[PDB]
Tab-separated table of C-alpha atoms and ligand atoms in Angstrom:
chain	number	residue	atom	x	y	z
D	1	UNK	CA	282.057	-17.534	18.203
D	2	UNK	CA	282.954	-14.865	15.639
D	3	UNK	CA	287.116	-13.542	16.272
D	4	UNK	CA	289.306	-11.278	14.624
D	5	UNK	CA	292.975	-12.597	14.019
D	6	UNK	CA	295.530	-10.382	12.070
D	7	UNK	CA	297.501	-12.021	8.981
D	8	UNK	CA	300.674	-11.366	8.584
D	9	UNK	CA	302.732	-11.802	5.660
D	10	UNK	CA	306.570	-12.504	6.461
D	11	UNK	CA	309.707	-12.876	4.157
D	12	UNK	CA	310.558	-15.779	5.875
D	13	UNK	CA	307.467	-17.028	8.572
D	14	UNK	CA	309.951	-19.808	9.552
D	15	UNK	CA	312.752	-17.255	10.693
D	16	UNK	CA	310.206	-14.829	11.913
D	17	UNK	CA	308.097	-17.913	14.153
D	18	UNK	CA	311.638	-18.724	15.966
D	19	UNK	CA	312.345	-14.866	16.515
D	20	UNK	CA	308.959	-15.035	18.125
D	21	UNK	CA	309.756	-17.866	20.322
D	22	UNK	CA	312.469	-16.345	21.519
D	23	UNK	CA	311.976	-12.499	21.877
D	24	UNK	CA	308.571	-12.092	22.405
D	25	UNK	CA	308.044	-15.775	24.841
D	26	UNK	CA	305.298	-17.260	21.719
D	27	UNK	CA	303.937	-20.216	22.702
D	28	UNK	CA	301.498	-22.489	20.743
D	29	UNK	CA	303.298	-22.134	17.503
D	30	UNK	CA	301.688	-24.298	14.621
D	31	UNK	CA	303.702	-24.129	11.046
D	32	UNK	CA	302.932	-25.712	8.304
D	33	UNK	CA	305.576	-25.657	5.609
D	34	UNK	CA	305.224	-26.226	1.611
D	35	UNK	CA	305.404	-30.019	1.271
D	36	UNK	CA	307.613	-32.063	-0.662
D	37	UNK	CA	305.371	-32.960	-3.160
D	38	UNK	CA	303.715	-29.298	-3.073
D	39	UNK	CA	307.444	-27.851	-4.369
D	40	UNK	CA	306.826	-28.582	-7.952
D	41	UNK	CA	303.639	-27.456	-8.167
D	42	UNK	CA	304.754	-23.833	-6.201
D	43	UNK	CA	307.337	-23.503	-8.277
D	44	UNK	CA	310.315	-24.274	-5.972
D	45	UNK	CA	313.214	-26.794	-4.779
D	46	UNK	CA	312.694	-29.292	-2.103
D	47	UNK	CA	314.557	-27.176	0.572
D	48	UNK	CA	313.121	-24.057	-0.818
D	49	UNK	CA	309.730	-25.717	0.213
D	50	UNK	CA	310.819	-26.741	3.423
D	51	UNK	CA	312.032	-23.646	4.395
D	52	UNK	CA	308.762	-22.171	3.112
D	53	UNK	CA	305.127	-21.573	5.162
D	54	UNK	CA	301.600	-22.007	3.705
D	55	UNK	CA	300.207	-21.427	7.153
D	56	UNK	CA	301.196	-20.898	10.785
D	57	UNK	CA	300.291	-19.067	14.169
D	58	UNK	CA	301.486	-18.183	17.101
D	59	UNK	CA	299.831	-17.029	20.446
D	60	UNK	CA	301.860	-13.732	22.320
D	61	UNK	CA	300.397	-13.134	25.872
D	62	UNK	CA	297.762	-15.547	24.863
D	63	UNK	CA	296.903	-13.807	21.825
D	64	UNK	CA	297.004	-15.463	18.252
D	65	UNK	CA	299.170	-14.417	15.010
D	66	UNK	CA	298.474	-15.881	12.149
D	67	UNK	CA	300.574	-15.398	9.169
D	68	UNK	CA	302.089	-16.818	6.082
D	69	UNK	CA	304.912	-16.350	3.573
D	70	UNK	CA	304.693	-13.475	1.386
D	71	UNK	CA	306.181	-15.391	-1.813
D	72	UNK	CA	306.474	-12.175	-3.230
D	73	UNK	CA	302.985	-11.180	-3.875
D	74	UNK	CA	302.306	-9.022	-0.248
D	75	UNK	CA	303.780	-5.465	0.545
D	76	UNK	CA	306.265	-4.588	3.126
D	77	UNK	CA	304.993	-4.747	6.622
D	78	UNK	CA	304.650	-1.305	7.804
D	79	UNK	CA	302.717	0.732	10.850
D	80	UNK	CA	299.513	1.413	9.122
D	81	UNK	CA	297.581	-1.203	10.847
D	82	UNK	CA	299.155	-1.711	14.638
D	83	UNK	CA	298.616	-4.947	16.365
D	84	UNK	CA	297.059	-3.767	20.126
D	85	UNK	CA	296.943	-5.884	23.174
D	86	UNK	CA	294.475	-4.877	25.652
D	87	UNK	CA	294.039	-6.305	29.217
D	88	UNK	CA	292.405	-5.413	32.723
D	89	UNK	CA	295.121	-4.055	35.105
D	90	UNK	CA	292.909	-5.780	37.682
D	91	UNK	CA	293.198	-9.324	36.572
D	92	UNK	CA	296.338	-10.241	38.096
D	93	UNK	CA	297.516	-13.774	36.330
D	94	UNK	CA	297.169	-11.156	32.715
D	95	UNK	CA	298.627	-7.891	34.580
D	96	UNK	CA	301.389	-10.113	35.415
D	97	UNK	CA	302.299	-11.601	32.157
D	98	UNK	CA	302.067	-8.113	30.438
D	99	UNK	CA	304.906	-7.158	33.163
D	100	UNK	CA	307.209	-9.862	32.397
D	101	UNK	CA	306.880	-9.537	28.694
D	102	UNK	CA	307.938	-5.916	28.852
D	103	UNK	CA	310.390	-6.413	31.464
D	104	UNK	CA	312.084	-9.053	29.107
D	105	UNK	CA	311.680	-7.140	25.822
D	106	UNK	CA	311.931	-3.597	26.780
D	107	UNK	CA	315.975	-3.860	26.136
D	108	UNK	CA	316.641	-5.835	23.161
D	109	UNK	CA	318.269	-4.470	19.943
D	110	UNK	CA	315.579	-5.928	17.404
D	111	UNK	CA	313.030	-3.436	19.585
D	112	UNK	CA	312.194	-0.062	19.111
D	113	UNK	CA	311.019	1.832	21.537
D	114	UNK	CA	308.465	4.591	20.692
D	115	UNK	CA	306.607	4.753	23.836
D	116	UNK	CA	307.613	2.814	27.196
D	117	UNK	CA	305.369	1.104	29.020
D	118	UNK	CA	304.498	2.932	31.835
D	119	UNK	CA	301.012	4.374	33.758
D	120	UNK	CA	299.007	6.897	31.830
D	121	UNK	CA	297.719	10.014	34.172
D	122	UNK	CA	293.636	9.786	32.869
D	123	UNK	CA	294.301	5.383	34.129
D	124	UNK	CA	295.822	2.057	33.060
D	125	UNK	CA	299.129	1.763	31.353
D	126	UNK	CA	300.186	2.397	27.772
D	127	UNK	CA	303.631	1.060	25.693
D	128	UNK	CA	304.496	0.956	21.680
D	129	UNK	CA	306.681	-0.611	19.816
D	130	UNK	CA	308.077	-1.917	16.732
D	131	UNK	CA	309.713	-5.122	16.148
D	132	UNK	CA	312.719	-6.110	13.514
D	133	UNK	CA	310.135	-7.469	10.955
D	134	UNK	CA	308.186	-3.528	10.913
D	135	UNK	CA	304.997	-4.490	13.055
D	136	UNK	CA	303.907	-1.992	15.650
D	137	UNK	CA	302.565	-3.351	19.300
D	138	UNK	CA	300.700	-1.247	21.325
D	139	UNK	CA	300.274	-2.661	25.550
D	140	UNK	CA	296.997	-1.081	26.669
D	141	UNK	CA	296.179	-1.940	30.391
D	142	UNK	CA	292.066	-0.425	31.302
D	143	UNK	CA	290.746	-0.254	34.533
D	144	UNK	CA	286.490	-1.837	33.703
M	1	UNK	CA	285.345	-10.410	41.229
M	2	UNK	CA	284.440	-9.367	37.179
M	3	UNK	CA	287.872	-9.076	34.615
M	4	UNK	CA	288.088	-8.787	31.086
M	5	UNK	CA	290.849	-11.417	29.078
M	6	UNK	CA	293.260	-10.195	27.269
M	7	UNK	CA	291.870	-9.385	23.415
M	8	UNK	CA	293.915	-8.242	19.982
M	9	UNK	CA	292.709	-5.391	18.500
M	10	UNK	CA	293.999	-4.026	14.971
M	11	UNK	CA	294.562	-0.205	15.248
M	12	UNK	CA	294.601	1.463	11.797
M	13	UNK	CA	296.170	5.035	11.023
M	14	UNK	CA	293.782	6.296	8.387
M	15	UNK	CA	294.417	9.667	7.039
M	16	UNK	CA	290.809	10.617	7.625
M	17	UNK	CA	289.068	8.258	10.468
M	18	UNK	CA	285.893	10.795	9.924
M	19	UNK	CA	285.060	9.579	6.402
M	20	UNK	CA	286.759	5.954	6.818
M	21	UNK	CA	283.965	5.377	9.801
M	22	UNK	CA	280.765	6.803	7.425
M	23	UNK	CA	282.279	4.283	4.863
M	24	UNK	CA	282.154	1.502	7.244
M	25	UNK	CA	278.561	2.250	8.569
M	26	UNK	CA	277.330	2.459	4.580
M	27	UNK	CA	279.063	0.021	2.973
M	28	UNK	CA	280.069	-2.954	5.781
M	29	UNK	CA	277.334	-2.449	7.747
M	30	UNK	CA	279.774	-1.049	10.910
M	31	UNK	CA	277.730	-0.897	14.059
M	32	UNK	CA	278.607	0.516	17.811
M	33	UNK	CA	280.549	3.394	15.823
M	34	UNK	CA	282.488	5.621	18.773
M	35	UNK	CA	284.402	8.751	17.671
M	36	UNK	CA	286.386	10.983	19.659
M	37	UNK	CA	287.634	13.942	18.096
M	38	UNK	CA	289.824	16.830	19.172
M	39	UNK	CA	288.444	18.624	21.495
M	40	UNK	CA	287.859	22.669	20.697
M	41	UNK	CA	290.775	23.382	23.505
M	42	UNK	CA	293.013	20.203	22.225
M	43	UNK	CA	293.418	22.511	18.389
M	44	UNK	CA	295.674	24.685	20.083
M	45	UNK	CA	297.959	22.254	21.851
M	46	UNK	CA	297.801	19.524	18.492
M	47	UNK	CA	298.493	23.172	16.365
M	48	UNK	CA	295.142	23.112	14.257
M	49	UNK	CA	292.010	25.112	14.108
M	50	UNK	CA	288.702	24.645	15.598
M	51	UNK	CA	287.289	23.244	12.369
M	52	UNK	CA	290.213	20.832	11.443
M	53	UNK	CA	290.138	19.700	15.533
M	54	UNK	CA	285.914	18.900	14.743
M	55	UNK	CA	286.981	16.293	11.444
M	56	UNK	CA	290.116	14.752	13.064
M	57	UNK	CA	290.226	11.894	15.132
M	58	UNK	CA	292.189	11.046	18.363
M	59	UNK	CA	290.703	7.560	18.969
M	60	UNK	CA	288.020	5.802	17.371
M	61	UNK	CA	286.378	2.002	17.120
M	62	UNK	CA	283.609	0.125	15.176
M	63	UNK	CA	282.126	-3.282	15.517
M	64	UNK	CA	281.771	-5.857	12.172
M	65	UNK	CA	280.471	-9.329	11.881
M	66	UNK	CA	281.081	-8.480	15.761
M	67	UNK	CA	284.437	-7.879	15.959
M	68	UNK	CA	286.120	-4.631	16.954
M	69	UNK	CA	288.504	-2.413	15.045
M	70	UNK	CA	290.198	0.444	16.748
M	71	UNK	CA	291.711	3.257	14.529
M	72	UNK	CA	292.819	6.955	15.018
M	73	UNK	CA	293.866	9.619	12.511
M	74	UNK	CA	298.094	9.335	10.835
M	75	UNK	CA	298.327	13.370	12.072
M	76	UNK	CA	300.875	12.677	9.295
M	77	UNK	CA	303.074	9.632	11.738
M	78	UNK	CA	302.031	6.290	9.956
M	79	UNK	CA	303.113	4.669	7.178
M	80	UNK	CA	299.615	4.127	4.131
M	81	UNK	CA	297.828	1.152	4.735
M	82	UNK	CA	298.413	-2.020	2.526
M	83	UNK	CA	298.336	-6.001	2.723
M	84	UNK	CA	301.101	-7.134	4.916
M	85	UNK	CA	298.607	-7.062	7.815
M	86	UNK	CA	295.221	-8.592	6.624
M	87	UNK	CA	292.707	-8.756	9.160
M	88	UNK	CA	290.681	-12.392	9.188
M	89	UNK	CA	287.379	-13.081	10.525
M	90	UNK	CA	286.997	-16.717	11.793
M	91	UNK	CA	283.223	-17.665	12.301
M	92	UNK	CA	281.867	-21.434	12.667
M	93	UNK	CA	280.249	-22.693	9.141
M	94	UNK	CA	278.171	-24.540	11.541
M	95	UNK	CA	276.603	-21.808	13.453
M	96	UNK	CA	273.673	-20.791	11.659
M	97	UNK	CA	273.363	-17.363	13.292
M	98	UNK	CA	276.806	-16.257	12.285
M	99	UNK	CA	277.308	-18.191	9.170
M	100	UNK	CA	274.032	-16.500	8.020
M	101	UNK	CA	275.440	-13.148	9.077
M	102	UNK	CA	279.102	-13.563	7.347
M	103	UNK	CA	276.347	-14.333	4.122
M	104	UNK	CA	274.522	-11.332	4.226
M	105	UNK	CA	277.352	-9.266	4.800
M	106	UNK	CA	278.939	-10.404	1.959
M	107	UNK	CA	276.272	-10.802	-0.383
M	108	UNK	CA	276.093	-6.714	0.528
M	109	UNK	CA	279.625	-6.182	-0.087
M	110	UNK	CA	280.313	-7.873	-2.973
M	111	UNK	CA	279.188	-5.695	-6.080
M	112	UNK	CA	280.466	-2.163	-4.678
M	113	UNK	CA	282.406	-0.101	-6.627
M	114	UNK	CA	285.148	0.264	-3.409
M	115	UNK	CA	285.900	-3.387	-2.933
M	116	UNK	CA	288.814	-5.451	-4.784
M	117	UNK	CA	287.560	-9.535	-4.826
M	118	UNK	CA	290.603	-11.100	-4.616
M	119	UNK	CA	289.308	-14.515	-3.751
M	120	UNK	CA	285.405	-14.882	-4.040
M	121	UNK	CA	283.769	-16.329	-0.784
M	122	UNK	CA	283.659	-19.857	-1.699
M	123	UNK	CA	283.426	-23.302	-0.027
M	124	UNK	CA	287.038	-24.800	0.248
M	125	UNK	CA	288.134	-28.447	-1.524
M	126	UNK	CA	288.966	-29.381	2.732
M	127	UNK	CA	286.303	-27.573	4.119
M	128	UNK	CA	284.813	-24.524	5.185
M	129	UNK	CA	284.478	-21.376	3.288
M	130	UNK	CA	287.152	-18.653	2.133
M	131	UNK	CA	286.992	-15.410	0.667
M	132	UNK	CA	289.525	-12.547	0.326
M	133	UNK	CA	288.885	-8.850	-0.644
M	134	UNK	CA	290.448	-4.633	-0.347
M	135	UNK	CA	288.759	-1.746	0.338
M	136	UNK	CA	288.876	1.653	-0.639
M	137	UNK	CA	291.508	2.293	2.130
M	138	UNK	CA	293.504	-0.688	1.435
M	139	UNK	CA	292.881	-2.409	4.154
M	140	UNK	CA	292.633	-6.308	3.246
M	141	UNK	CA	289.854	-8.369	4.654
M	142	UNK	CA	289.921	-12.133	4.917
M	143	UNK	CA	286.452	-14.425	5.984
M	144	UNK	CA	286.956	-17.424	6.926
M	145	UNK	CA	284.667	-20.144	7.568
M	146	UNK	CA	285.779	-23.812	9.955
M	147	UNK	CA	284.089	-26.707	9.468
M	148	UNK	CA	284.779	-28.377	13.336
M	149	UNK	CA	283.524	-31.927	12.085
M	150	UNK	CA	286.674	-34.639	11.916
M	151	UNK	CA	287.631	-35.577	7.806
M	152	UNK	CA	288.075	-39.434	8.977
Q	1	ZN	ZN1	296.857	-24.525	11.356
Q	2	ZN	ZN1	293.853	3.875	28.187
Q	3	ZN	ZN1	286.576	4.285	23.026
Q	4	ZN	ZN1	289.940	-23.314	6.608
């Protein structure tokens, strides 16, 4: 019933959705760009508006994003609120895709590091990063 | 045989989770508050002293509307909290059990002296409901009510 989604407010959600796609594996992504019609009454030209995003999401190890464009009213995304992702290290299909995701992102340049993903001594496994657009990921594997 | 799915979970850095959790209970009506602090032998290996170990925070969570919200103290690390991560709360305008919940809570909230309306919870032109406010800590709260039933 009732769900907590976090809202993020890109430069650019249309750049930032494909950067998605491709570094993180997003699936599911929905956008929904200014219309032609909606340009005038935004303020902006028709490719302006087509380049432009009223709404989207995105779903990251089957997870949703939503977010939006900033259009200059929302601060700069920072670490103050971190985006965790928490799964049960004994539900394989989940285990598995947390694997693979770090595995694949763990090395590319738009990633930063600040803990690796690895086994914690007290149980589970525990990575953080930050991404190129500022937004910090935490991987938090439990044993329940 | 049981496993948990995979869930999201916003983790805010406040500067003081002690207070920020109190505020929560009072004025959100936060329920299934947890607190961890540092431990009396933890002050010595995070450098403080047995009274500044008992107010700060190492992990922490609350629950509201139902939804979880982990945080943990900056220790000086994180950046101050502002709007370019809101957090939303989706409910069903249909539901009567939550819908009436998302009410109360905001009929509560509204008039405090610590929250910024930015959008008052309203019914939407399309459908469903919307409202948009800060707190005290910055942190940018979104409700957001779905109407399920088809426009044609
Ligand atoms: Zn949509
Ligand atoms: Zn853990
Ligand atoms: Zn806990
Ligand atoms: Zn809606």
């Amino acid at each position: 019933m009732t769900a907590l989604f976090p809202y993020i407010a890109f430069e650019n959600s249309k750049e930032a959705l494909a950067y998605y796609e491709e570094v993180f594996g997003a699936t599911d992504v929905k956008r929904l760009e200014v219309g032609e019609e909606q340009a005038s009454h935004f303020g902006m030209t028709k490719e302006e508006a087509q380049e432009a995003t009223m709404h989207a999401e995105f779903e990251v190890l089957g997870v949703k994003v939503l977010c939006s464009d900033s259009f200059g009213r929302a601060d700069k995304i920072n670490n103050g609120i971190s985006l965790l992702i928490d799964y049960d290290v004994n539900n394989k299909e989940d285990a598995d895709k947390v694997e693979a995701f770090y595995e694949q992102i763990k090395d590319h340049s738009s990633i930063e590091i600040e803990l690796p993903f690895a086994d914690q001594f007290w149980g589970g496994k525990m990575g953080v990063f930050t991404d190129k657009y500022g937004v910090r990921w935490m991987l938090h594997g439990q044993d329940y």
